[PDB]
Amino acid sequence: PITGLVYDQRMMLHHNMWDSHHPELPQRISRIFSRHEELRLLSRCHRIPARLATEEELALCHSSKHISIIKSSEHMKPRDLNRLGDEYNSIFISNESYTCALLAAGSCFNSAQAILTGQVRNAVAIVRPPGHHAEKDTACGFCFFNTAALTARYAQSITRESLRVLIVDWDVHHGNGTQHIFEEDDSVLYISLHRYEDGAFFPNSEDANYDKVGLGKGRGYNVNIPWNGGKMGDPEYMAAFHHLVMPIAREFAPELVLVSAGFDAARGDPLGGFQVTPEGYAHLTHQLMSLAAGRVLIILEGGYNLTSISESMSMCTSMLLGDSPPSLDHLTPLKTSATVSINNVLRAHAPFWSSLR
Ligand SMILES: CC(=O)NCc1ccc(C(=O)NO)cc1
Ligand SMILES: [K+]
Ligand SMILES: [K+]
Ligand SMILES: [Zn+2]
Question: Where does Zn(2+) bind (predicted)?
């Protein structure tokens, strides 16, 4: 029972040259890596090497136009980097951004291959920039290519096209790119939990609402769990996993589990405003390990409080390594609004998932 880990400091080169304090900091991944060292987690892992994704692997999910444009930014002067970045919603670009997005995706491909060939049971990928807001034809929300989506398609390309992949997105934002890439696809189940507030939270679209259940053959295979009405924490996330995430996942029976693991729902993050604890994330990980014979890959997305993301992702790697789940703090009763959300998702997905109660 071996846990893999992939990290490469070259992904720190991506940076905002007009705001050195932009929250999507190079030091996100370095701080996480150091905490793994300090807690003696890194030494217990098998170290998976990082690599560049190829242009053909990007074509698994992204259009040739979008690859061509981001690729061209490697040679742009700062004035053009600024112009191009402003053509997207919430994007900054440097000369290293294209290469770092390649490394993030390729690092995850290597970890998926390591899991699928039996070299490791599960794995953690400490990567940046994130991916789950990137769509087929455009970058968005600090994301250039959709790393989690590309990894699912990569996993299928090296096994069989019908490989059942579950993607759990517990980043506090809706992974619009991941939903849309797989919207008509019943081979990849997308489950996202996210702050919604009636469509006023980034990325500010009703695409994130519970009633978007998929299209065509993929009806039932897109599960949005939207939060309305202020701060949520461990009790709401534990209830959502108990009533929705784990019953649907068990009925889907994935062969590989990818976590789009933002840590911006963590206590202390200003961009999320939630208070999921490191012990909370440990329990979420431990539940997911009961699926897919333990084939779980945890992929960093967002998460912007440096101390919070370091403690929270370390807690996840500790669970993958087999440590006992930590004792949870007091679980306050479910906020009425959280009950409403879980009930809305249950009602919307009752047709597709016979397990639901
Ligand atoms: C200031 C602001 O709200 N900018 C928009 C925005 C915010 C967060 C993300 C993200 O990726 N979070 O994990 C992306 C875009
Ligand atoms: K999410
Ligand atoms: K789907
Ligand atoms: Zn986020």
Answer: 171, 173, 264
CATH number at residue 242: 3.40.800.20
Q: What is the C-alpha to C-alpha distance for residues 141 and 132, in angstroms, rounded to an integer?
A: 9
- Method used to obtain the model: X-ray
90 lines ligand 1 (CB under 6 A): yes
Annotation: binding site for Zn(2+): 171, 173, 264
203 lines ligand 1 (CB under 6 A): no
Per-residue b or e along 166-204, where b marks 16 or more CB atoms closer than 10 Å to that residue's CB: bbbbbbbbbbbbbbbbbbebbbbbbbbbbbbeeeebbbe
Rounded to 10 deg, the angle between the 147-157 and 97-116 helix axes is: 40
Do residues 264 and 303 lie in contact, with contact meaning Cβ atoms separated by under 8 Å? yes
Q: Which range of residues forms the domain containing residue 186?
A: 1-357
Burial of 319 (0-12, 13-18, 19+ CB in 10 A): buried
Residue given tokens 């807001």 in the structure block? 133
Tell me how crowded residue 230 is: count the other CB atoms within 10 A of its CB: 12
What is the per-residue burial (b if ≥16 Cβ within 10 Å, else e) of 129-141?
Answer: bbbbbbbeebbbb
